[PDB]
Amino acid sequence: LFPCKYASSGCEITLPHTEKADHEELCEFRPYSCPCPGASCKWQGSLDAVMPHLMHQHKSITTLQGEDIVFLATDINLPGAVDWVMMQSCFGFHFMLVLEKQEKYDGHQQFFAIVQLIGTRKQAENFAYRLELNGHRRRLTWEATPRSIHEGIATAIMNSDCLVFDTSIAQLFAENGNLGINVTISMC
Amino acid sequence: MANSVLFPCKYASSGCEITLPHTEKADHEELCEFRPYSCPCPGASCKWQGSLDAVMPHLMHQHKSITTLQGEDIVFLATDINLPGAVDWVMMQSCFGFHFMLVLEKQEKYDGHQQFFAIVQLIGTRKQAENFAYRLELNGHRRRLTWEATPRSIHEGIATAIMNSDCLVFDTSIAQLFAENGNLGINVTISMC
Ligand SMILES: [Cl-]
Ligand SMILES: [Cl-]
Ligand SMILES: [Cl-]
Ligand SMILES: [Zn+2]
Ligand SMILES: [Zn+2]
Ligand SMILES: [Zn+2]
Ligand SMILES: [Zn+2]
């Protein structure tokens, strides 16, 4: 038996080595980290402190209001490890929209697009999101339940549990070097 | 009397004996029965060549392990997607008076990275293919991944589109989330457009 990493935050669970990694990802006593990806903010705090932190320390992150929006990522053929981030406001919540370009597999630059709720895991379960890329007679769609920012996105990226494509695919969908991602959030 | 210069059909070497004035050339050729087509089954094993109409018979007689499902909206189950031997899954779909070949391929296109590629091609011409769309959908616990495009024609083939990632492309990790007991169901819907 081993204690959870977040024991010092008030977590009581002791588990064997094999059950430890799964619990801590989903543990409630996990700190809410600055949800903006991926370097180099090291801020942590409570859920109610997240939106003010973004507003005070990440002023260039824009918000669009609506359930049905276009997240237009500019200059997607910019080389290397890039992030695009915006927030979407609907249903009384803010959602973090992230497009990340990273060399997850060696020699293969890929894009990962994912939505997170600024709120709890329990709250996140009432939502669904759709990410849709549109091209000339082409459409690529991903639909899932948004991750709570509590969980982060590193695990979903590693598991490809989000929309995954690459620079090859992106060319079908890009217009003037930009990528329009249709993001629809709905309740279930 | 000087008659005007005649042109042999571009499929003369395949047998076509008709010669024609230049204006009739394109109109005959894109209708000519002697046009050769390679075997559309992936990939390099079969060396058969023949007419468009000889294709589906070739697949029925020489590629008996390929199943044909009937209907515009089907499920293709790719079994044992995790087996190390497993490379290709092929199925035919019959609807709208045509036959469409669904191909799933597992490969390391980038070294060290195993990916699945899925695509549809029409047993027919590009012109015929351009009146269709196809949708591939993977379904899991609160997850859905969808790709929609115009079917490839068999003359163009699918190898080039796969190389370009102009098809459904996904990882072995996410394949697992969509798989049940080692099998991956792909919903395929063909539509007119
Ligand atoms: Cl809709
Ligand atoms: Cl799950
Ligand atoms: Cl439908
Ligand atoms: Zn814990
Ligand atoms: Zn921050
Ligand atoms: Zn001819
Ligand atoms: Zn053959």
Numbering used by the authors:
A (entry chain B): 95 to 282
B (entry chain A): 90 to 282
From the manuscript:
Siah1 (seven-in-absentia homologue 1) is an E3 ligase belonging to the RING (really interesting new gene) domain family. It acts as a scaffolding protein and interacts with a variety of different substrates for ubiquitination and subsequent degradation. Siah1 functions in Ras, DNA-damage and hypoxia signalling pathways, and is implicated in various cancers. The SBD forms a dimerization interface with its counterpart from the partner subunit to create a Z-shaped structure.
Two isomorphous crystal structures of Siah1 were determined at 1.95 and 1.58 Å resolution. There are two molecules per asymmetric unit, labelled chains A and B, and they form a dimer consistent both with the observation that a single species of approximate mass 39 kDa was noted during size-exclusion chromatography purification and with published structures of Siah1. Continuous well defined electron density is observed for the polypeptide backbone in the 1.95 Å resolution structure, corresponding to residues 91–282 of the native Siah1 sequence. Here, chain A also contains an additional methionine at the N-terminus, which is a cloning artifact. One outlier is present in the lower resolution structure and 96.9% of the amino acids are situated in the most favoured region. In the lower resolution structure the r.m.s.d. is 5.36 Å (181 Cα positions). Superposition of the two new structures on each other gives r.m.s.d. values of 0.80 and 4.89 Å for chains A (175 Cα atoms) and B (164 Cα atoms), respectively. The overall molecular packing in each lattice remains well conserved and it is simply that there is space that allows the N-­terminal zinc finger of the B chain to adopt a position where it can either interact with a molecule at 1 − x + ½, y + ½, −z + ½ as in the highest resolution structure or interact with a molecule at 1 − x, 1 − y, z as in the case of the lower resolution structure.
